[PDB]
PDB file of all heavy atoms in Angstrom:
ATOM      1  N   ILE A  39       0.831  -1.200   0.000  1.00 37.52           N
ATOM      2  CA  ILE A  39       0.000   0.000   0.000  1.00 37.52           C
ATOM      3  C   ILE A  39       0.865   1.249   0.000  1.00 37.52           C
ATOM      4  O   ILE A  39       0.546   2.243  -0.661  1.00 37.52           O
ATOM      5  CB  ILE A  39      -0.957  -0.019   1.202  1.00 37.52           C
ATOM      6  N   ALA A  40       1.979   1.213   0.730  1.00 35.97           N
ATOM      7  CA  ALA A  40       2.893   2.344   0.765  1.00 35.97           C
ATOM      8  C   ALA A  40       3.587   2.528  -0.569  1.00 35.97           C
ATOM      9  O   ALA A  40       3.795   3.662  -1.006  1.00 35.97           O
ATOM     10  CB  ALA A  40       3.921   2.156   1.877  1.00 35.97           C
ATOM     11  N   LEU A  41       3.957   1.430  -1.228  1.00 35.17           N
ATOM     12  CA  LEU A  41       4.555   1.531  -2.550  1.00 35.17           C
ATOM     13  C   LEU A  41       3.570   2.124  -3.545  1.00 35.17           C
ATOM     14  O   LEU A  41       3.937   2.986  -4.352  1.00 35.17           O
ATOM     15  CB  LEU A  41       5.028   0.155  -3.009  1.00 35.17           C
ATOM     16  N   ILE A  42       2.303   1.708  -3.467  1.00 30.45           N
ATOM     17  CA  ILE A  42       1.273   2.260  -4.348  1.00 30.45           C
ATOM     18  C   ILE A  42       1.063   3.742  -4.073  1.00 30.45           C
ATOM     19  O   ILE A  42       0.954   4.554  -5.002  1.00 30.45           O
ATOM     20  CB  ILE A  42      -0.039   1.470  -4.194  1.00 30.45           C
ATOM     21  N   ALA A  43       1.011   4.121  -2.794  1.00 34.23           N
ATOM     22  CA  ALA A  43       0.792   5.518  -2.444  1.00 34.23           C
ATOM     23  C   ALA A  43       1.973   6.383  -2.846  1.00 34.23           C
ATOM     24  O   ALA A  43       1.792   7.466  -3.414  1.00 34.23           O
ATOM     25  CB  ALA A  43       0.527   5.641  -0.947  1.00 34.23           C
ATOM     26  N   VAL A  44       3.188   5.911  -2.573  1.00 34.86           N
ATOM     27  CA  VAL A  44       4.387   6.664  -2.902  1.00 34.86           C
ATOM     28  C   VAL A  44       4.534   6.789  -4.405  1.00 34.86           C
ATOM     29  O   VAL A  44       5.006   7.812  -4.911  1.00 34.86           O
ATOM     30  CB  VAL A  44       5.622   6.001  -2.272  1.00 34.86           C
ATOM     31  N   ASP A  45       4.139   5.750  -5.143  1.00 35.96           N
ATOM     32  CA  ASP A  45       4.092   5.868  -6.589  1.00 35.96           C
ATOM     33  C   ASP A  45       3.048   6.884  -7.022  1.00 35.96           C
ATOM     34  O   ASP A  45       3.252   7.602  -8.005  1.00 35.96           O
ATOM     35  CB  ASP A  45       3.811   4.501  -7.205  1.00 35.96           C
ATOM     36  N   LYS A  46       1.946   6.988  -6.279  1.00 35.80           N
ATOM     37  CA  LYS A  46       0.861   7.874  -6.678  1.00 35.80           C
ATOM     38  C   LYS A  46       1.021   9.276  -6.100  1.00 35.80           C
ATOM     39  O   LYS A  46       1.189  10.243  -6.849  1.00 35.80           O
ATOM     40  CB  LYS A  46      -0.481   7.271  -6.253  1.00 35.80           C
ATOM     41  N   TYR A  47       1.001   9.397  -4.779  1.00 38.31           N
ATOM     42  CA  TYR A  47       0.904  10.702  -4.142  1.00 38.31           C
ATOM     43  C   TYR A  47       2.238  11.446  -4.224  1.00 38.31           C
ATOM     44  O   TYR A  47       3.281  10.870  -4.541  1.00 38.31           O
ATOM     45  CB  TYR A  47       0.456  10.552  -2.691  1.00 38.31           C
ATOM     46  N   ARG A  48       2.197  12.752  -3.938  1.00 36.17           N
ATOM     47  CA  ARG A  48       3.351  13.614  -4.158  1.00 36.17           C
ATOM     48  C   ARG A  48       3.956  14.169  -2.876  1.00 36.17           C
ATOM     49  O   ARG A  48       5.108  13.865  -2.565  1.00 36.17           O
ATOM     50  CB  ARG A  48       2.955  14.770  -5.087  1.00 36.17           C
ATOM     51  N   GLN A  49       3.200  14.933  -2.092  1.00 36.91           N
ATOM     52  CA  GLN A  49       3.794  15.708  -1.013  1.00 36.91           C
ATOM     53  C   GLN A  49       3.890  14.874   0.257  1.00 36.91           C
ATOM     54  O   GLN A  49       3.601  13.677   0.272  1.00 36.91           O
ATOM     55  CB  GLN A  49       2.998  16.989  -0.766  1.00 36.91           C
ATOM     56  N   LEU A  50       4.334  15.516   1.339  1.00 35.99           N
ATOM     57  CA  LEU A  50       4.369  14.841   2.630  1.00 35.99           C
ATOM     58  C   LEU A  50       2.963  14.666   3.193  1.00 35.99           C
ATOM     59  O   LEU A  50       2.595  13.577   3.650  1.00 35.99           O
ATOM     60  CB  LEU A  50       5.251  15.623   3.602  1.00 35.99           C
ATOM     61  N   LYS A  51       2.156  15.730   3.161  1.00 34.43           N
ATOM     62  CA  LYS A  51       0.785  15.629   3.643  1.00 34.43           C
ATOM     63  C   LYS A  51      -0.049  14.730   2.747  1.00 34.43           C
ATOM     64  O   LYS A  51      -0.888  13.977   3.237  1.00 34.43           O
ATOM     65  CB  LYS A  51       0.147  17.012   3.735  1.00 34.43           C
ATOM     66  N   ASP A  52       0.183  14.783   1.433  1.00 33.58           N
ATOM     67  CA  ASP A  52      -0.635  14.009   0.505  1.00 33.58           C
ATOM     68  C   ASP A  52      -0.387  12.513   0.657  1.00 33.58           C
ATOM     69  O   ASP A  52      -1.334  11.724   0.777  1.00 33.58           O
ATOM     70  CB  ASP A  52      -0.354  14.460  -0.926  1.00 33.58           C
ATOM     71  N   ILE A  53       0.880  12.106   0.676  1.00 33.92           N
ATOM     72  CA  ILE A  53       1.200  10.696   0.870  1.00 33.92           C
ATOM     73  C   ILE A  53       0.897  10.261   2.295  1.00 33.92           C
ATOM     74  O   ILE A  53       0.505   9.107   2.525  1.00 33.92           O
ATOM     75  CB  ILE A  53       2.665  10.423   0.496  1.00 33.92           C
ATOM     76  N   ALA A  54       1.054  11.166   3.266  1.00 35.29           N
ATOM     77  CA  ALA A  54       0.654  10.866   4.634  1.00 35.29           C
ATOM     78  C   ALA A  54      -0.839  10.566   4.721  1.00 35.29           C
ATOM     79  O   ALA A  54      -1.246   9.580   5.348  1.00 35.29           O
ATOM     80  CB  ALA A  54       1.025  12.034   5.544  1.00 35.29           C
ATOM     81  N   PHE A  55      -1.667  11.380   4.056  1.00 37.68           N
ATOM     82  CA  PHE A  55      -3.114  11.189   4.095  1.00 37.68           C
ATOM     83  C   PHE A  55      -3.528   9.927   3.364  1.00 37.68           C
ATOM     84  O   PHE A  55      -4.396   9.190   3.845  1.00 37.68           O
ATOM     85  CB  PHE A  55      -3.823  12.396   3.488  1.00 37.68           C
ATOM     86  N   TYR A  56      -2.927   9.670   2.199  1.00 37.82           N
ATOM     87  CA  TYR A  56      -3.249   8.459   1.453  1.00 37.82           C
ATOM     88  C   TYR A  56      -2.893   7.209   2.247  1.00 37.82           C
ATOM     89  O   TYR A  56      -3.680   6.257   2.297  1.00 37.82           O
ATOM     90  CB  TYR A  56      -2.531   8.459   0.106  1.00 37.82           C
ATOM     91  N   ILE A  57      -1.728   7.207   2.903  1.00 34.87           N
ATOM     92  CA  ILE A  57      -1.343   6.065   3.726  1.00 34.87           C
ATOM     93  C   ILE A  57      -2.295   5.911   4.904  1.00 34.87           C
ATOM     94  O   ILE A  57      -2.801   4.811   5.168  1.00 34.87           O
ATOM     95  CB  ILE A  57       0.112   6.215   4.200  1.00 34.87           C
ATOM     96  N   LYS A  58      -2.575   7.019   5.607  1.00 33.43           N
ATOM     97  CA  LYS A  58      -3.393   6.967   6.815  1.00 33.43           C
ATOM     98  C   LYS A  58      -4.801   6.489   6.511  1.00 33.43           C
ATOM     99  O   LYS A  58      -5.390   5.731   7.287  1.00 33.43           O
ATOM    100  CB  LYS A  58      -3.436   8.342   7.484  1.00 33.43           C
ATOM    101  N   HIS A  59      -5.353   6.908   5.373  1.00 33.59           N
ATOM    102  CA  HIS A  59      -6.679   6.445   4.990  1.00 33.59           C
ATOM    103  C   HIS A  59      -6.641   4.990   4.545  1.00 33.59           C
ATOM    104  O   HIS A  59      -7.311   4.132   5.130  1.00 33.59           O
ATOM    105  CB  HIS A  59      -7.240   7.335   3.881  1.00 33.59           C
ATOM    106  N   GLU A  60      -5.838   4.687   3.520  1.00 31.12           N
ATOM    107  CA  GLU A  60      -5.928   3.395   2.861  1.00 31.12           C
ATOM    108  C   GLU A  60      -5.406   2.247   3.713  1.00 31.12           C
ATOM    109  O   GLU A  60      -5.760   1.095   3.446  1.00 31.12           O
ATOM    110  CB  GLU A  60      -5.177   3.441   1.531  1.00 31.12           C
ATOM    111  N   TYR A  61      -4.588   2.512   4.735  1.00 33.78           N
ATOM    112  CA  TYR A  61      -4.148   1.413   5.582  1.00 33.78           C
ATOM    113  C   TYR A  61      -5.196   1.004   6.603  1.00 33.78           C
ATOM    114  O   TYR A  61      -5.048  -0.051   7.226  1.00 33.78           O
ATOM    115  CB  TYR A  61      -2.851   1.784   6.298  1.00 33.78           C
ATOM    116  N   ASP A  62      -6.247   1.804   6.783  1.00 34.46           N
ATOM    117  CA  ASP A  62      -7.301   1.492   7.739  1.00 34.46           C
ATOM    118  C   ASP A  62      -8.303   0.476   7.208  1.00 34.46           C
ATOM    119  O   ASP A  62      -9.173   0.030   7.966  1.00 34.46           O
ATOM    120  CB  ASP A  62      -8.037   2.770   8.146  1.00 34.46           C
ATOM    121  N   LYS A  63      -8.214   0.113   5.930  1.00 33.48           N
ATOM    122  CA  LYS A  63      -9.112  -0.894   5.384  1.00 33.48           C
ATOM    123  C   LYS A  63      -8.696  -2.290   5.829  1.00 33.48           C
ATOM    124  O   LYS A  63      -9.427  -2.959   6.565  1.00 33.48           O
ATOM    125  CB  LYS A  63      -9.138  -0.798   3.857  1.00 33.48           C
ATOM    126  N   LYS A  64      -7.494  -2.719   5.437  1.00 32.49           N
ATOM    127  CA  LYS A  64      -7.047  -4.085   5.693  1.00 32.49           C
ATOM    128  C   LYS A  64      -6.802  -4.362   7.167  1.00 32.49           C
ATOM    129  O   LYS A  64      -6.652  -5.529   7.542  1.00 32.49           O
ATOM    130  CB  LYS A  64      -5.778  -4.384   4.896  1.00 32.49           C
ATOM    131  N   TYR A  65      -6.736  -3.328   7.997  1.00 30.60           N
ATOM    132  CA  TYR A  65      -6.779  -3.507   9.438  1.00 30.60           C
ATOM    133  C   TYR A  65      -8.228  -3.442   9.892  1.00 30.60           C
ATOM    134  O   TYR A  65      -8.895  -2.426   9.648  1.00 30.60           O
ATOM    135  CB  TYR A  65      -5.964  -2.436  10.140  1.00 30.60           C
ATOM    136  N   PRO A  66      -8.761  -4.485  10.525  1.00 31.35           N
ATOM    137  CA  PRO A  66     -10.153  -4.424  10.984  1.00 31.35           C
ATOM    138  C   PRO A  66     -10.293  -3.543  12.208  1.00 31.35           C
ATOM    139  O   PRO A  66      -9.852  -3.912  13.299  1.00 31.35           O
ATOM    140  CB  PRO A  66     -10.484  -5.887  11.299  1.00 31.35           C
ATOM    141  N   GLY A  67     -10.894  -2.372  12.032  1.00 31.08           N
ATOM    142  CA  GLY A  67     -10.991  -1.430  13.125  1.00 31.08           C
ATOM    143  C   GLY A  67     -11.957  -1.877  14.196  1.00 31.08           C
ATOM    144  O   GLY A  67     -13.177  -1.808  14.014  1.00 31.08           O
ATOM    145  N   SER A  68     -11.422  -2.321  15.331  1.00 31.19           N
ATOM    146  CA  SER A  68     -12.245  -2.802  16.434  1.00 31.19           C
ATOM    147  C   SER A  68     -12.694  -1.611  17.268  1.00 31.19           C
ATOM    148  O   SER A  68     -11.877  -0.960  17.924  1.00 31.19           O
ATOM    149  CB  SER A  68     -11.470  -3.805  17.283  1.00 31.19           C
ATOM    150  N   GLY A  69     -13.997  -1.331  17.257  1.00 32.02           N
ATOM    151  CA  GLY A  69     -14.546  -0.252  18.055  1.00 32.02           C
ATOM    152  C   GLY A  69     -14.801  -0.642  19.499  1.00 32.02           C
ATOM    153  O   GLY A  69     -15.655  -0.057  20.170  1.00 32.02           O
ATOM    154  N   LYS A  70     -14.056  -1.631  19.986  1.00 35.06           N
ATOM    155  CA  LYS A  70     -14.154  -2.099  21.361  1.00 35.06           C
ATOM    156  C   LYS A  70     -13.374  -1.157  22.277  1.00 35.06           C
ATOM    157  O   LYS A  70     -12.997  -0.046  21.894  1.00 35.06           O
ATOM    158  CB  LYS A  70     -13.656  -3.537  21.461  1.00 35.06           C
ATOM    159  N   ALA A  71     -13.130  -1.599  23.513  1.00 38.75           N
ATOM    160  CA  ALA A  71     -12.479  -0.752  24.505  1.00 38.75           C
ATOM    161  C   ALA A  71     -11.032  -0.432  24.153  1.00 38.75           C
ATOM    162  O   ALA A  71     -10.494   0.560  24.652  1.00 38.75           O
ATOM    163  CB  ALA A  71     -12.544  -1.418  25.879  1.00 38.75           C
ATOM    164  N   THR A  72     -10.397  -1.240  23.310  1.00 35.85           N
ATOM    165  CA  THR A  72      -9.043  -0.939  22.870  1.00 35.85           C
ATOM    166  C   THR A  72      -9.038   0.282  21.958  1.00 35.85           C
ATOM    167  O   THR A  72      -9.890   0.425  21.076  1.00 35.85           O
ATOM    168  CB  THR A  72      -8.439  -2.138  22.141  1.00 35.85           C
ATOM    169  N   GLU A  73      -8.072   1.169  22.180  1.00 34.59           N
ATOM    170  CA  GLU A  73      -7.928   2.399  21.414  1.00 34.59           C
ATOM    171  C   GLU A  73      -6.646   2.332  20.599  1.00 34.59           C
ATOM    172  O   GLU A  73      -5.566   2.103  21.153  1.00 34.59           O
ATOM    173  CB  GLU A  73      -7.904   3.620  22.334  1.00 34.59           C
ATOM    174  N   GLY A  74      -6.767   2.535  19.292  1.00 33.77           N
ATOM    175  CA  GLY A  74      -5.611   2.504  18.417  1.00 33.77           C
ATOM    176  C   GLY A  74      -5.810   3.448  17.255  1.00 33.77           C
ATOM    177  O   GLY A  74      -6.938   3.801  16.899  1.00 33.77           O
ATOM    178  N   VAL A  75      -4.692   3.869  16.668  1.00 38.10           N
ATOM    179  CA  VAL A  75      -4.744   4.830  15.573  1.00 38.10           C
ATOM    180  C   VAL A  75      -3.594   4.606  14.601  1.00 38.10           C
ATOM    181  O   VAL A  75      -2.760   3.714  14.794  1.00 38.10           O
ATOM    182  CB  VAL A  75      -4.728   6.275  16.102  1.00 38.10           C
ATOM    183  N   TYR A  76      -3.561   5.409  13.543  1.00 36.41           N
ATOM    184  CA  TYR A  76      -2.483   5.417  12.569  1.00 36.41           C
ATOM    185  C   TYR A  76      -1.527   6.568  12.858  1.00 36.41           C
ATOM    186  O   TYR A  76      -1.923   7.618  13.371  1.00 36.41           O
ATOM    187  CB  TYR A  76      -3.042   5.542  11.149  1.00 36.41           C
ATOM    188  N   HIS A  77      -0.257   6.356  12.534  1.00 33.45           N
ATOM    189  CA  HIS A  77       0.746   7.404  12.608  1.00 33.45           C
ATOM    190  C   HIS A  77       1.279   7.679  11.210  1.00 33.45           C
ATOM    191  O   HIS A  77       1.388   6.775  10.380  1.00 33.45           O
ATOM    192  CB  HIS A  77       1.893   7.024  13.550  1.00 33.45           C
ATOM    193  N   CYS A  78       1.595   8.939  10.944  1.00 31.89           N
ATOM    194  CA  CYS A  78       2.071   9.345   9.631  1.00 31.89           C
ATOM    195  C   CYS A  78       3.357  10.143   9.786  1.00 31.89           C
ATOM    196  O   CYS A  78       3.362  11.196  10.431  1.00 31.89           O
ATOM    197  CB  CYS A  78       1.007  10.161   8.898  1.00 31.89           C
ATOM    198  N   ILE A  79       4.448   9.629   9.214  1.00 31.42           N
ATOM    199  CA  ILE A  79       5.687  10.391   9.086  1.00 31.42           C
ATOM    200  C   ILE A  79       6.309  10.099   7.728  1.00 31.42           C
ATOM    201  O   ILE A  79       6.919   9.046   7.552  1.00 31.42           O
ATOM    202  CB  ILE A  79       6.669  10.048  10.217  1.00 31.42           C
ATOM    203  N   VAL A  80       6.169  11.011   6.765  1.00 30.11           N
ATOM    204  CA  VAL A  80       6.699  10.820   5.411  1.00 30.11           C
ATOM    205  C   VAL A  80       7.567  12.031   5.082  1.00 30.11           C
ATOM    206  O   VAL A  80       7.095  13.004   4.487  1.00 30.11           O
ATOM    207  CB  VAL A  80       5.597  10.641   4.366  1.00 30.11           C
ATOM    208  N   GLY A  81       8.861  11.943   5.399  1.00 31.42           N
ATOM    209  CA  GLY A  81       9.753  13.084   5.285  1.00 31.42           C
ATOM    210  C   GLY A  81      11.219  12.704   5.218  1.00 31.42           C
ATOM    211  O   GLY A  81      11.583  11.526   5.188  1.00 31.42           O
ATOM    212  N   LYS A  82      12.066  13.737   5.203  1.00 28.54           N
ATOM    213  CA  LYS A  82      13.497  13.552   4.963  1.00 28.54           C
ATOM    214  C   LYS A  82      14.218  12.994   6.187  1.00 28.54           C
ATOM    215  O   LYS A  82      14.734  11.871   6.153  1.00 28.54           O
ATOM    216  CB  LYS A  82      14.124  14.879   4.536  1.00 28.54           C
ATOM    217  N   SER A  83      14.266  13.759   7.283  1.00 31.08           N
ATOM    218  CA  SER A  83      14.943  13.276   8.488  1.00 31.08           C
ATOM    219  C   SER A  83      14.380  13.993   9.714  1.00 31.08           C
ATOM    220  O   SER A  83      14.735  15.144   9.979  1.00 31.08           O
ATOM    221  CB  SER A  83      16.445  13.466   8.387  1.00 31.08           C
ATOM    222  N   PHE A  84      13.520  13.297  10.447  1.00 33.16           N
ATOM    223  CA  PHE A  84      13.227  13.535  11.854  1.00 33.16           C
ATOM    224  C   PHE A  84      13.607  12.262  12.612  1.00 33.16           C
ATOM    225  O   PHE A  84      14.190  11.336  12.041  1.00 33.16           O
ATOM    226  CB  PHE A  84      11.762  13.916  12.057  1.00 33.16           C
ATOM    227  N   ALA A  85      13.279  12.209  13.899  1.00 33.98           N
ATOM    228  CA  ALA A  85      13.601  11.022  14.678  1.00 33.98           C
ATOM    229  C   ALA A  85      12.682  10.930  15.885  1.00 33.98           C
ATOM    230  O   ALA A  85      12.088  11.921  16.319  1.00 33.98           O
ATOM    231  CB  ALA A  85      15.067  11.020  15.127  1.00 33.98           C
ATOM    232  N   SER A  86      12.582   9.716  16.418  1.00 32.33           N
ATOM    233  CA  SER A  86      11.835   9.446  17.637  1.00 32.33           C
ATOM    234  C   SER A  86      12.275   8.094  18.175  1.00 32.33           C
ATOM    235  O   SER A  86      12.860   7.277  17.458  1.00 32.33           O
ATOM    236  CB  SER A  86      10.320   9.465  17.399  1.00 32.33           C
TER     237      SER A  86
END
């Protein structure tokens, strides 16, 4: 999905949004008590 998005989308926000949206399909979002989300970092050099 990331290869498809990176081939398609252009900017940091654009590829970040495409990844964040399209990766939520193949992950079954459990609306139970567990809380989880997507993270987006598509850039040159930050760190964590």
